[PDB]
Design a protein around this ligand. Structure first.
Ligand SMILES: [Mg+2]
Ligand SMILES: [Mg+2]
Length: 158
């Protein structure tokens, strides 16, 4: 497993094995690709980030991933695949977040994008994310570059 510190200096433990940290993760993160572009969402408080959020009680992590993509980008998922899992060792709470990769079929218009501004398309990620004020802190640590490198090696992208 990979171990590093996030943007707010909290310890993060990253793994690509099947749910090693928790049997039932309460958070999900979805890396979205629409054609040859990256599908992101603009959080009203955080900024540009890949879709994700909290898992509902009656809902499972896979169903929560599809729901969060639809809510934050208005996108229809063609295929959803589990990539890995990460644990965030916070100051007051420890969270377990599942990473999913989603190939996007289409973007449908919605009346409301909930707690986000809606879908944002990127041909390629800017340089460098860590010091970009328009981006969310969740995109600023090592979770994103390591996950993207694992997507290339698996043959899921390009
Ligand atoms: Mg969310
Ligand atoms: Mg949401």
């Amino acid at each position: 497993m990979y171990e590093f510190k996030d943007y707010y200096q909290n310890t993060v433990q990253l793994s690509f094995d099947d749910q090693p940290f928790s049997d039932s993760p309460k958070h999900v993160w979805v890396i979205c690709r629409f054609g040859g572009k990256w599908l992101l969402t603009e959080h009203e408080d955080r900024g540009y980030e890949f879709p994700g959020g909290k898992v509902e009680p009656m809902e499972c992590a896979e169903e929560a991933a599809l729901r969060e993509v639809k809510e934050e980008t208005g996108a229809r998922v063609k295929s959803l695949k589990y990539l890995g899992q990460y644990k965030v060792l916070g100051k007051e709470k420890v969270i377990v977040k599942n990473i999913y990769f989603a190939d996007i079929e289409k973007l449908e218009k919605q009346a409301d994008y909930f707690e986000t501004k809606g879908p944002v398309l990127f041909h390629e990620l800017p340089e460098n994310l860590s010091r970009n004020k328009k981006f969310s802190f969740i995109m600023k640590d090592s979770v994103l570059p390591i996950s993207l490198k694992k997507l290339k090696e698996s043959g899921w992208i390009e």
